[PDB]
Amino acid sequence: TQNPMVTGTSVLGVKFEGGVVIAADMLGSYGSLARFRNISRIMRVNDSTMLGASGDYADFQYLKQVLGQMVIDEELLGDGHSYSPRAIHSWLTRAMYSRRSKMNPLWNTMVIGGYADGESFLGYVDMLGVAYEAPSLATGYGAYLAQPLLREVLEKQPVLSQTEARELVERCMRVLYYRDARSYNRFQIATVTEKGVEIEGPLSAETNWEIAHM
Amino acid sequence: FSPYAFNGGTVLAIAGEDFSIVASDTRLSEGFSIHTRDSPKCYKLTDKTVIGCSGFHGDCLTLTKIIEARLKMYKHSNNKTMTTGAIAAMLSTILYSRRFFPYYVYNIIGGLDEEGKGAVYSFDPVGSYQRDSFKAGGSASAMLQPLLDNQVGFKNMQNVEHVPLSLDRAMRLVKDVFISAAERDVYTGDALRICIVTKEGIREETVPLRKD
Amino acid sequence: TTIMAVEFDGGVVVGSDSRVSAGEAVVNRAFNKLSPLHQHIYCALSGSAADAQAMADMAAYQLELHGLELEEPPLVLAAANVVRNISYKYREDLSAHLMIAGWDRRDGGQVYGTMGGMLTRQPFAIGGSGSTYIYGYVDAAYKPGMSPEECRSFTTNAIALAMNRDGSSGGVIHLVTITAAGVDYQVILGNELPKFYDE
Amino acid sequence: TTIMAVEFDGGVVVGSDSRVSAGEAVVNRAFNKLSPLHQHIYCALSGSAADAQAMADMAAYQLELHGLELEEPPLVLAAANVVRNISYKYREDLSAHLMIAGWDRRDGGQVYGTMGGMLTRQPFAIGGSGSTYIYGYVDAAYKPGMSPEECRSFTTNAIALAMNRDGSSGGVIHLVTITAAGVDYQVILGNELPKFYDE
Amino acid sequence: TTTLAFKFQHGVIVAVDSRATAGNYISSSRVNKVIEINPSLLGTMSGCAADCQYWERLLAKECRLYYLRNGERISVSAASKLLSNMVYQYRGMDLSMGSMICGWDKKGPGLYYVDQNGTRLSGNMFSTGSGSTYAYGVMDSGYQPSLSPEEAYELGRRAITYATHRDSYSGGIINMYHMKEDGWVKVESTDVNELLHQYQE
Amino acid sequence: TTIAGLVFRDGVILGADTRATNDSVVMDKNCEKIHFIAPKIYCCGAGVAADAEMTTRMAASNMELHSLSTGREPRVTTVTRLLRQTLFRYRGHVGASLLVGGVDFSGPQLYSVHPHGSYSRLPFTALGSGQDAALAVLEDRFQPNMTLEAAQELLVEAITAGILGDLGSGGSVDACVITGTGAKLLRTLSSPTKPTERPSQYYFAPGTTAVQSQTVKPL
Amino acid sequence: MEYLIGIQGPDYVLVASDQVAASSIVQMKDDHDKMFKMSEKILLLCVGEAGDTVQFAEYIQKNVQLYKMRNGYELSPTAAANFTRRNLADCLRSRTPYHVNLLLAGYDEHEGPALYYMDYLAALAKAPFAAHGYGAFLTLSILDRYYTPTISRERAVELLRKCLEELQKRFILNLPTFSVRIIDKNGIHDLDNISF
Amino acid sequence: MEYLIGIQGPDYVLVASDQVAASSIVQMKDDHDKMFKMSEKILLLCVGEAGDTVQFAEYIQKNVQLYKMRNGYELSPTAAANFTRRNLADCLRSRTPYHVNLLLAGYDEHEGPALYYMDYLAALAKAPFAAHGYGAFLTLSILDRYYTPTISRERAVELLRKCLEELQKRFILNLPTFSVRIIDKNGIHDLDNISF
Amino acid sequence: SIMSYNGGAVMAMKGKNCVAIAADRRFGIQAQMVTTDFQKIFPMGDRLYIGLAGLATDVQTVAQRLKFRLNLYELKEGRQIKPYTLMSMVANLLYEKRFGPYYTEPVIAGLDPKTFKPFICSLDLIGCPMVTDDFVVSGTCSEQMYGMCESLWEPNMDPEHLFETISQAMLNAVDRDAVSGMGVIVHIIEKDKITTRTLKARMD
Numbered sequence A: 001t002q003n004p005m006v007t008g009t010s011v012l013g014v015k016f017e018g019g020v021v022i023a024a025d026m027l028g029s030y031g032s033l034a035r036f037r038n039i040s041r042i043m044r045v046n047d048s049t050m051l052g053a054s055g056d057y058a059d060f061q062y063l064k065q066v067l068g069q070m071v072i073d074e075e076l077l078g079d080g081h082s083y084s085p086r087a088i089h090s091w092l093t094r095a096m097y098s099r100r101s102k103m104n105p106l107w108n109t110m111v112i113g114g115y116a117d118g119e120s121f122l123g124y125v126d127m128l129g130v131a132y133e134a135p136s137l138a139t140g141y142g143a144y145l146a147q148p149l150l151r152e153v154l155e156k157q158p159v160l161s162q163t164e165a166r167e168l169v170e171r172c173m174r175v176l177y178y179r180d181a182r183s184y185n186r187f188q189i190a191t192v193t194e195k196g197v198e199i200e201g202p203l204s205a206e207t208n209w210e211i212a213h214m
Numbered sequence B: 001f002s003p004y005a006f007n008g009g010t011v012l013a014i015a016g017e018d019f020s021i022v023a024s025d026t027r028l029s030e031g032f033s034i035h036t037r038d039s040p041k042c043y044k045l046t047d048k049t050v051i052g053c054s055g056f057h058g059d060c061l062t063l064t065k066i067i068e069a070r071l072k073m074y075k076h077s078n079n080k081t082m083t084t085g086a087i088a089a090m091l092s093t094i095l096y097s098r099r100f101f102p103y104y105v106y107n108i109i110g111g112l113d114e115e116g117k118g119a120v121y122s123f124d125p126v127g128s129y130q131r132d133s134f135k136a137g138g139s140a141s142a143m144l145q146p147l148l149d150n151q152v153g154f155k156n157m158q159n160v161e162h163v164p165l166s167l168d169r170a171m172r173l174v175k176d177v178f179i180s181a182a183e184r185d186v187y188t189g190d191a192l193r194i195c196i197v198t199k200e201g202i203r204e205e206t207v208p209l210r211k212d
Numbered sequence C, D: 001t002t003i004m005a006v007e008f009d010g011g012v013v014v015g016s017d018s019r020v021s022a023g024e025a026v027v028n029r030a031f032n033k034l035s036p037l038h039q040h041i042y043c044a045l046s047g048s049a050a051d052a053q054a055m056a057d058m059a060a061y062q063l064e065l066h067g068l069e070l071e072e073p074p075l076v077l078a079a080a081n082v083v084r085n086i087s088y089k090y091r092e093d094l095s096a097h098l099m100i101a102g103w104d105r106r107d108g109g110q111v112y113g114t115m116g117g118m119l120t121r122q123p124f125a126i127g128g129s130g131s132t133y134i135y136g137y138v139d140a141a142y143k144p145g146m147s148p149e150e151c152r153s154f155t156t157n158a159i160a161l162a163m164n165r166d167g168s169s170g171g172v173i174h175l176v177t178i179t180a181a182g183v184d185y186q187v188i189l190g191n192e193l194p195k196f197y198d199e
Numbered sequence E: 001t002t003t004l005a006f007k008f009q010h011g012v013i014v015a016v017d018s019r020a021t022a023g024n025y026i027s028s029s030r031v032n033k034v035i036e037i038n039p040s041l042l043g044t045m046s047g048c049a050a051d052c053q054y055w056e057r058l059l060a061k062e063c064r065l066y067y068l069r070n071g072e073r074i075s076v077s078a079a080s081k082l083l084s085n086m087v088y089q090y091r092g093m094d095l096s097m098g099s100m101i102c103g104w105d106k107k108g109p110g111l112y113y114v115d116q117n118g119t120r121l122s123g124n125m126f127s128t129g130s131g132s133t134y135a136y137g138v139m140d141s142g143y144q145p146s147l148s149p150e151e152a153y154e155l156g157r158r159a160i161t162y163a164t165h166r167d168s169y170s171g172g173i174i175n176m177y178h179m180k181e182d183g184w185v186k187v188e189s190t191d192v193n194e195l196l197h198q199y200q201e
Numbered sequence F: 001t002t003i004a005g006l007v008f009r010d011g012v013i014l015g016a017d018t019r020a021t022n023d024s025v026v027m028d029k030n031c032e033k034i035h036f037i038a039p040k041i042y043c044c045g046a047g048v049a050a051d052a053e054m055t056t057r058m059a060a061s062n063m064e065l066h067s068l069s070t071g072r073e074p075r076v077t078t079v080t081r082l083l084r085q086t087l088f089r090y091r092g093h094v095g096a097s098l099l100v101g102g103v104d105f106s107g108p109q110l111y112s113v114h115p116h117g118s119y120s121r122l123p124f125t126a127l128g129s130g131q132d133a134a135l136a137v138l139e140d141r142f143q144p145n146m147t148l149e150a151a152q153e154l155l156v157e158a159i160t161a162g163i164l165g166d167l168g169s170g171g172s173v174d175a176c177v178i179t180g181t182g183a184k185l186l187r188t189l190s191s192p193t194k195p196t197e198r199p200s201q202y203y204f205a206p207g208t209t210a211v212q213s214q215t216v217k218p219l
Numbered sequence G, H: 001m002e003y004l005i006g007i008q009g010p011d012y013v014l015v016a017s018d019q020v021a022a023s024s025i026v027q028m029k030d031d032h033d034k035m036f037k038m039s040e041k042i043l044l045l046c047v048g049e050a051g052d053t054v055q056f057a058e059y060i061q062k063n064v065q066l067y068k069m070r071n072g073y074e075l076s077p078t079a080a081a082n083f084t085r086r087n088l089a090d091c092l093r094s095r096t097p098y099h100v101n102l103l104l105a106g107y108d109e110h111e112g113p114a115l116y117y118m119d120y121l122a123a124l125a126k127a128p129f130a131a132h133g134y135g136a137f138l139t140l141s142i143l144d145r146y147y148t149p150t151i152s153r154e155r156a157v158e159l160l161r162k163c164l165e166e167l168q169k170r171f172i173l174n175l176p177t178f179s180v181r182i183i184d185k186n187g188i189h190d191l192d193n194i195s196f
Numbered sequence I: 001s002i003m004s005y006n007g008g009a010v011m012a013m014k015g016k017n018c019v020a021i022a023a024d025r026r027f028g029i030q031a032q033m034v035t036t037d038f039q040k041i042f043p044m045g046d047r048l049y050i051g052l053a054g055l056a057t058d059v060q061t062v063a064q065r066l067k068f069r070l071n072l073y074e075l076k077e078g079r080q081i082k083p084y085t086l087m088s089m090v091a092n093l094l095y096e097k098r099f100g101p102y103y104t105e106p107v108i109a110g111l112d113p114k115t116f117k118p119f120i121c122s123l124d125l126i127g128c129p130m131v132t133d134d135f136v137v138s139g140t141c142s143e144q145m146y147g148m149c150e151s152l153w154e155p156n157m158d159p160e161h162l163f164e165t166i167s168q169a170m171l172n173a174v175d176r177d178a179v180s181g182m183g184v185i186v187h188i189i190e191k192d193k194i195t196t197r198t199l200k201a202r203m204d
């Protein structure tokens, strides 16, 4: 996939005490045109893993299909073993790298969130096969706009509560709406804890336009 | 579309009489942004071998996994652990198999040889390699190598005793060159990870670097 | 960028979005694209910010001098001609469409499109990257004999529809109504814009 | 080319223009872009005529066989999936967007956009080169709970607005209404198309 | 890179420099540019370090297999032909290797030049690398077939030294070998800076 | 480079980092990026370093002539008109990206001026390769009519975000506070980074360096 | 550029070629043989792209020799020339073509002396005399001016000398020595080198 | 490619150059002089792009001669070398640059013998010996090996012969004859041509 | 690149009441070395020197045009130029060729004519100044020079220690650079004397 058609913008992710939260807007962009304003870019993988994706939407749908089948296949066995967030992150990394090596990349940047054995997981996988883990993540334009704010809060308070992480994410979504031209004021927030994966949406950020009068 | 990305990072290795040091910074980058400040570039292969990699992180992750599998395969068919020099010889052939679509990785191996002396091997991306006394690789490699030539190799000095390098001196020197490299190289920073390989095993040490 | 101007009996209504963009980054989210060339003459800017700003200033200067020499308020057609002249002469170098709208005692409310050096008088004009998405909308909604209130409502709706679809448009909606009585400015903020099918 | 499909309670309304173009020349001014894949499933073609025709035939064949094996009428989602599969697999070679619309006993009237291998279910969809000019129009005119008559009127208006503005669209308007009762075809000729602001 | 070899009355002399570079950066001054295939066979390297290192090591493998199969030890002429056929399969793919194969077989001292295009030439003297034109000038001016061993060693050392003085891509130390009937001997490993200062005085 | 400015209740605060890089190597660890245009008008420069330097010097010179002839305090609008008319003339080739701030008779004014000659008057702006990071801090925490100390803290946090997030920025934060009363140039207002202490060291004795020739010339 | 030349007489064929092997600006070898003996009465003169000439010539040589081993008699010059062209033309549109120029000289028991000219695109032409390389531009007219069909071998050698002398005076390249061979009913004979 | 060479002794300067004028593959002239006499004690050796060399050299020659006419004394080699560089560098960024390589040899009353090397980009360097062209790659090391600062003119001529002999054996181009001149306190002297 | 066509490296170091400037002596065209005594450091006053690295032709042209300007300045003003004033003069000269630049990066080192305060700075090809308190480098091996300077430089060094420091910095830096070297020249500028030394260096 050298020419991505419909693409999604930034995906945010931050760890908190006992879970991971990820956010993404519901926009499917066709160049600069906001073509699909109601598409979910966040997918539940299993009970402990969630996936957010930016970039080519068709590639994300294909990855969602393949990943979804894998999980179903594993569940059929009923042997007591299931894919952990780390294992899915590793699988995705190999998948992306393989595609990139044949000069036919899956044009996506992904954020993997998960909670297993009392440990929160947050992984990043780009289209070139570049992968790593961090306390907070932001793809695309979020790397320049959201990440700085996220990191700043984590430099003063490394361990956040669920409520703090949620509020911090909403603040980032507002900034993205103000400064990213391919963004849309309609997003989803997915949370993974010990109780499983939950997806809230659609949500909107409160916007201030006081400066226009100035 | 480009299949590569420059992710920065610097790796250093120094061989002593009965030790080898492999050190690296922990910043992972892309463009002008930082992906993470906690990505060490040195992996343990065996109890007396460490590899330091730098370059395109996509190839760095894949090559390390491939080497790790080849060490297990070698052990199963030869009934022993691969030595530092056999790992160096084998890595050369793995890098040369992608001679037309290369791994963009600069490797440096640090460990002990069969006589328990420090050994360092440096590689270019397509497999060419040689044994050296010390070596810098990656983003700040041209800043560090001249200083190691003067302070460890004693080049350009007259009336100087060529004493053997001790672990203590080698450790301070490693910390100093990385502190100097973090000031000038934009890709080098955050933290320094130092692995010391001796006959007693591999010990690790972490030291902070400038965050800007 | 989305700009629009409508003629009504006795004056004009001109409006635009407030987004300045550099690729995918919003460099200015509250920019005023409506610029006065004279007391009752305005121009809407679209295209390159530097070119449009330079052209608008050059024209304002030429019209000011012209007005003091002729001892009377400049006609809207004269302002359009001055803009057309500059736009045509430097067509190879300039990438900006300066839409002209205003009121004078001879012809009343007039709207002129002067893109690329070509001058055309229209009952209503739309420009900028976002105008492509509202062509169908304005062709079906426009009715002759609209009042200023209706014109203001018509303009607000069209701009709002374009801002939602066009990535290069957004922010707030600037609105100016020009008549014999004077210029009336108005700003419709993000939370007060017309709402249509969004999901 | 301009295509559009709308979902209504009990079925779908799908329509399109009839222009086939080669640069500035009209090679076929009365082409039928609405193609049946099965008894109650249709697809609108946009983009390359050869690619769309080949894809539609491949799908019709696959769905026909599938229907005889399962001993029942194929679901609209299955038809969309089959089209999506072909469209995604050959994304590098194919330049055609096959919009899917139909009726089945499980989900009723459904509209699916399958451009580039991405499958999305929508209450209404628009495609082709001419669809860019009616985005604003459909966002302001669409209302939930529309009847088939209203849906037919809504579709005709939107297509007419696009045909007037888009050089690649024109001719007549093909219209098909699909329900449980069957397929109803309709052709709105050039002299019977809706008229809006034209001068 | 500068490598040279010549036959004289007492065998073959082989000498090289030891510099490797990447652009203008000197990546090493201690590269070994002579491969010892067996005790009567040597290979020199010039061009891309990975291509030279890999294909010459592959020749060494083939030479060893030949000896186990035939019980006889490959000749210099057959070793060079094996190398030239190996790299000829990748012609046009941007391999970069200029090698000299030198040894002593049943037909006496042998010297061949082989390169990445498939060129294979037998000769009395050769020079390869970016500093090879400078080496040729000094080597051809002082070369005589009746040179004594010490005189041949001196000519080899002077030709490499003057090439490293003029060519930016050559330098470091000179590794010299002497190919004889009973096999090769490593003559010396001298730093070219000590040599040039002693010639300058 | 990260440069930023905001309008507060009584004036303008300008901010910058102090790192100057040659490609990917740090050349200067203490480059002054906030330049004097006039007593109550300052400028922060990003983009091509020699263009910024020459452009601001030419402007300061022309603005000084202007104020000598008129006998009055220069207006911020004049600086913006001189700068933008010069930049448009060169069609973007003079790569000067500037933030112009000052206080005149009409109050505090902040402008951003871009290389092709376009400009915008705003209550807060950021420029340079660290601009998105600084702008995120402003969008998240700016309020109109802040007090001098609140504005100083906000601008410092915005520059600091660029310093820690952008590899083209680093070093210290410099600030310029401009009000009706005074100008406070705070070169080195915050020093968030510093070279490590260094464990061991190196020492060269007397004649460690071998010398070939020597001439002494007395003055 | 390399130089090849062939002169066909009533009952013999005379061929000559330069002995320079070059690498960029330096002559690496000054006594390189560009002639390949395919059989007792056939010579193959080949020049062109480095690597290709030897690979191609050797391939032909091995096949010509194999024919003799399998049948008990040698392939004629004409059959050999056509075999060479066939092979060269087969690789023309392939991935690995042979960029070589050649001359095939031979003596057939029944047919007599033959000289064949072949370019890199595999066009085959029989000729009384021919030359390859940049030097052919300065010597072909000389052969046109002095060559007769009944020229004796002594006059042919003098005619060849005339051509080679022209190269010494007019050509920009340094070609000081040439290999000279003659093919007749008694086989291939080595004549003295023509040096300057 | 043309060949230039200069060797500076204690009280003289020795220069030599090839005499070949070429057009593509043919030597149109075999006795072309590449040396230009600027003054009684100054020689200008020039090679490079066709047309440029003569146009440039003549321009310098006319200006050097004009200086002598206006002042009554000749410009020194150093001043002449700098005048040449200044002019060459001025046309470097212009529309009509001069693609020439040169050597300026001269003898100054007070300063003695001088040899100047100048490339086409107008970088000027004083040197004990120098060479221009492809041949310089094969002869510079020879000068490095045998040259001493107190070399006599008889030994210098032998040293030059060594360099020229190397060209005959190693260089691919045909350069059979060289112009040899010497400049000292008695002016410019023509030595015998060195031919092969 | 045009800046590596001739090679070369220059560095200036500040000491306690003194300055040091050094450069390589190699003049070469691409891979071929032509001479080993090319001048890169020119005197611009009693205690003021300028080092130029980059294209050899522009190195000579810039030095000559600067000498022309400085000479006229000294006659008109009747005084010796200040180190900082020279930096501005040089920047102005390089900026005039904004679109068609001289390919050279000058390095200035000296002591003020009245207070003898050490001054060093470096400019780029366009004319942007970089006044520092420690050292400045320029040339094909700048990365290597930065490394050596960053770890070896110390504040308040006396003339002897400063000499050793800059010497070691240049020697080890040029040894890792293929087109730089063939000798090193060093100038130690003190208030009362100028010391010029040539170092024993590698000639390969």
Ligand SMILES: *[B]([O])([O])[C]([C][C]([C])[C])[N]C(=O)C1=[C]N([C]2[C][C][C][C][C]2)N=N1
Binding pocket: C001, C002, C019, C020, C021, C022, C027, C031, C033, C045, C046, C047, C048, C049, C050, C052, C128, C129, C168, F114, F118
């Ligand atoms: B609109 O999108 O057309 C808008 C209208 C202008 C303000 C008249 N134009 C722009 O968005 C725009 C942005 N820019 C530059 C981009 C690079 C940085 C400086 C501004 N130019 N026009």
Ligand SMILES: *[B]([O])([O])[C]([C][C]([C])[C])[N]C(=O)C1=[C]N([C]2[C][C][C][C][C]2)N=N1
Binding pocket: D001, D002, D019, D020, D021, D022, D027, D031, D033, D045, D046, D047, D048, D049, D050, D052, D128, D129, D168
């Ligand atoms: B429409 O403009 O998108 C239309 C839709 C098709 C019929 C599905 N396409 C075309 O106009 C069109 C024309 N052509 C070819 C042009 C060259 C001659 C053969 C037809 N392909 N698509």
Ligand SMILES: *[B]([O])([O])[C]([C][C]([C])[C])[N]C(=O)C1=[C]N([C]2[C][C][C][C][C]2)N=N1
Binding pocket: B124, E001, E002, E019, E020, E021, E022, E023, E031, E033, E045, E046, E047, E048, E049, E050, E052, E129, E130, E169
């Ligand atoms: B020599 O200069 O030819 C030398 C000989 C080798 C060591 C046997 N070669 C090299 O120095 C050399 C350079 N490179 C690559 C060139 C392109 C950039 C990466 C290095 N490989 N060998």
